[PDB]
Design a protein around this ligand. Sequence first.
Ligand SMILES: [N+]
Ligand SMILES: [N+]
Ligand SMILES: [N+]
Ligand SMILES: [N+]
Lengths: 341, 340, 339, 340
Amino acid sequence: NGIKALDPFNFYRIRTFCGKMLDVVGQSTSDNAMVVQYSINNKPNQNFLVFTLDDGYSIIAAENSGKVLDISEDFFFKGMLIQYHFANSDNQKFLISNNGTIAVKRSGKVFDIPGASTSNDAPVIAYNFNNAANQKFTFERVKTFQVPSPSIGTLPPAPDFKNDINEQLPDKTNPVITHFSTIPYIMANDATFNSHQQIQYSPYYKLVRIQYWEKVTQRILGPRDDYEYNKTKGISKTDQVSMTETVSMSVGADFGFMFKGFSASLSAQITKELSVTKSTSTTEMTEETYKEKYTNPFNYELARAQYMLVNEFYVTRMDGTRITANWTLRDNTQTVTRIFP
Amino acid sequence: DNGIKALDPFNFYRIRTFCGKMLDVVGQSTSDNAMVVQYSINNKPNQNFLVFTLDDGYSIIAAENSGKVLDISEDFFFKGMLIQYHFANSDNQKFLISNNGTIAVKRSGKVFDIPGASTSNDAPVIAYNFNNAANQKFTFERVKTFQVPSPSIGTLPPAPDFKNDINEQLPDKTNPVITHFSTIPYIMANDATFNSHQQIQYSPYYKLVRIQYWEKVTQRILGPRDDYEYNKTKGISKTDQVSMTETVSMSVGADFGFMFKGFSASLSAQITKELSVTKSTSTTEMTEETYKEKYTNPFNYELARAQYMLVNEFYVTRMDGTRITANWTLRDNTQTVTRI
Amino acid sequence: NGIKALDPFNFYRIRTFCGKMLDVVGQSTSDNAMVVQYSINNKPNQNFLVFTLDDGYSIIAAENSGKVLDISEDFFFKGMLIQYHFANSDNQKFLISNNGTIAVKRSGKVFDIPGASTSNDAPVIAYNFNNAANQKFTFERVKTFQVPSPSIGTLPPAPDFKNDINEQLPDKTNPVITHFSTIPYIMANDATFNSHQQIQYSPYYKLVRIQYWEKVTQRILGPRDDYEYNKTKGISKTDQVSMTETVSMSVGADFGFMFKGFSASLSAQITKELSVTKSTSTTEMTEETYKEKYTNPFNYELARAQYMLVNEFYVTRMDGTRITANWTLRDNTQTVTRI
Amino acid sequence: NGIKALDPFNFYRIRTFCGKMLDVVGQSTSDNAMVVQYSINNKPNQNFLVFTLDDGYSIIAAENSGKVLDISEDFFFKGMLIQYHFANSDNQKFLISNNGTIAVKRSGKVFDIPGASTSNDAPVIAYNFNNAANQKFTFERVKTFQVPSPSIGTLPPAPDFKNDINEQLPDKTNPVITHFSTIPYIMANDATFNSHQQIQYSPYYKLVRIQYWEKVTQRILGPRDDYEYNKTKGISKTDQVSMTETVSMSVGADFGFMFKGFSASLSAQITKELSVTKSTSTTEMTEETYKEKYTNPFNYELARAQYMLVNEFYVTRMDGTRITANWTLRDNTQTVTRIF
Ligand SMILES: [N+]
Ligand SMILES: [N+]
Ligand SMILES: [N+]
Ligand SMILES: [N+]
């Protein structure tokens, strides 16, 4: 037996050995954080989302709030299952297996119904694995939702001269959405939605990548004339801060992404989905504008235009509402030079 | 509904739930936390309890397995759960045991409840609104019985008197006699050499004992018109005041009444009754002071004058009689006898 | 909260609050009539047909036999859900609503899984509606079948003389199927199929109406000649008995249909589908043959032909197999006379 | 394993595998005869009496109605467990075993919770034994009652003359209660108590035997003097019919009891408790009165007195209330003759 695979866009019902379902409210526990197995209610308190991370451990989020399942390390109530806001803690990371066991990352203990209770307010306490039926759970599909996909297009080539030395080439190519990454609400910080609102309306947020060619300079100069032009590379501090505040990410000096806090758990997925490299750099990149000088090497009058690859990254809600401005990263490494024949 | 259920103080009781299981402060899956759950009969101290009934009619339920008592959590995350916690004079630890079978929390009025009427071995207890369901009813069973030794009691003798010998030296103090004692639960008394667990094991009840005797302030023989000044002392020492408060959270007020602090207040009525002492109405605490008094003989014939002052000594012992504190001495200035 | 609509030609699976299905056999109930909540087995004992009547209430029939869901009125087992043959009784009539509730017609009580049992042999007991999850059920399409439709033709006009040749006109026009009605097997009494066989092979029966003109008389006579000819109206007793025996219907004296017993439940539907009138007559119609006399009013040789509208009604199985002879009704009211 | 033994005078609670109890009313089944699994109520709906018969099979009676557990033979509800008025039917007779299984006498299948339902209002259906947990049940003592026992005395000897030929001996000895038999209410036909009333107030009825000597004749005779006197033996028709109507018993011609209907199931107990013989006679006894003649063979003047053993049988409720007249049986076989 191995890791259980669950579709991400389904709300799930967690069925216990006796046919009752985990409920984050309960009857006698209505006024506290306890999670108990209760009779089927067909209510959001019994609906969950399972977010599987790179390490194979998953985050289980209740629909009733934005909060997730948590195993208390409290001295007085050690081992209890409660509902607590996401804090990227090992007691909140669970391993769902085909055998039916939900295993805590922090401790090898698994979900267990104390005394194999069949009662409606029976709590869940972490217990050493013993292969008893009361330790086994089944996930049922409750309802399904869809995440719209943005239209995707490939990057066009940098514009080129067409037999006219005095033609002005476009300042930039039409921006195209080349990639996007689908991440859970727990990762994205939305100023205008609280955690509960998020899971209700935007369970997954989308991080979208647009690529286009930006014209650094175009000038016509004499056979043996030189000129100096400004060129800009990198990403602004404001974009760096905003990226970190929203998704706990920044861009490293090596043009790789730096994953901080919660984001690190999905580093592999995000890099793969955006076609970007994980940073190996200690320091974060800054926007730099510097002067570069070009001299005409040919004796005939010559026209030169240079394009730089530019990336814009932004986060949207599931529906597509954009919650942040585009974060601009200029890659000086990827550049195309155009001249008149 | 029917009324307060009365339980003998010197019995350990087993609390039986609706399904025939017993409340257990350890549990199986809860062994590593403070949760109290109904479990199958094991006849072990984790299922044994001792009941302390206070003046207000509410009782404290103390486990035998530890010195801790039953408590209802007010934590945001685990509100209403029943756990074992060190005793504090808080209403969530005070419960009303009634003939109808309900254990009611003082703070909230809610009663002990087995969630979902679970018959399971680790079913927890949660305070829940009274609905007269079977799962809210509990029965107390006698498990074991113990006896508290009582100190021998004698009346205060009369102050010593002269027997036709003007040169006789009267006793400096009369033989001390134990006039009163008060039986209090271990939760009230702080024992330096026994921890709470040890206390419930070995001295569930402590004894607060009152000794009374006459102490001779002065004796003198003088001529028709002779003057002298002698020391006289009244009150209770600062050290005794601190020790009394430290040990049983009590002190003596300036009006010769006792001041009850913290836990002690819960049994004030019992203690005052058992010791035959008055509750203080004074804000300030009494202090021992020594002052000089001057006497002149009013008669032309030679006479001898001796004065005795009534002295109280209060001390705390363990159930077996082991003394854990020095006698706390209170000098009653108003109660004095003069002999000629 | 309104009435739920289900396609008639689908077999349905009744899904309970816990994802288990109603099963008319069960494990511990295999030897009795009880219907219980059971895990999916993909067998006909979990397959049902829903027959919606004129009153909006529906009949639920299990595929395993011809029998339908029934709520016991037994003193000892009152309120239990069992499988029992159709008897057109209110305890067998159920109201399916969008809220998910199946409501008994006789009482206000609805289907309920006692104690919200998740067990494989949990019974079903009628209980007062409380909006609990254990009272809500979902119908899922399992498999579907098609009911053939007969070729439909309009009534031709009665034939007329051509060129005054005084030729012999057709005795009857080519019969055409003007109408047909699709009804469930529970309404039809089939001698050669038992109830179990019916639901297996002919879930719905078809009642077909054919109309054509019948020549009552044709004769050529001289000026002012009179003659008496026989004319026949109505429906035969044998057809009346066979119609009642097969579909519990008869034809009333007012040329309307009389719906008796089970048939009444679909009276409106049937009348609408056949374009026929519900009878207001106390007595049933009989076939009558009587003489009618004509005198030529015109001072010349004249040819007269009269046609009467004739209806033939018959019942077939879903595949089209005809189980009864045509029932003939001659409509005296609708007649055409030509010269 | 073997037959489980239960004390007869206890009300019992039948516990299912999940800790819930059999309830003869239920919630959704409140309006029908079904017996279902339900949570503990501490109510008579869940209280039963177990009547163990001679064959080892037992009858379980509900306190809430007086009706007994019955396994339906209905075509539509075959195998369902309901409460039904008592009849001497094998489906109502169950075998309680140490393993926890309740087996129907009529059909081998035992009590089973369908689908191992842990829910309330879960039915009980007879199912083939498979040793599953849902087939095992445990009996808990709920409450206990006592059946008063009448004072028992031995039969005194028939009276004898005391040196006076003119002395008149007593017509009968003071009657004494030699035996009684404790029988369940289902056996006894009580006009004034219905089944519900019976199980509430007289779960067991008592059949009591009184014995005494009755003087058939007394006379003093001279030499060779003879006379004819009436003698009566047997039991009256009215007593026979009343005995049959009340406890379905009668007395056979061989002075043994004939057990009819349910009574036969308890034959061994009753015969033992009353010290009476089970009848082997085809026909029932009738009361007969006939003349018997005695001749004095001796020339002494002699007084002759003859006593016949007389039995009185009657039925009382548990408290002792008598519901029927004494049934009089005169045994001519046991007779004593006295001479002077
Ligand atoms: N509520
Ligand atoms: N243990
Ligand atoms: N089945
Ligand atoms: N009940």
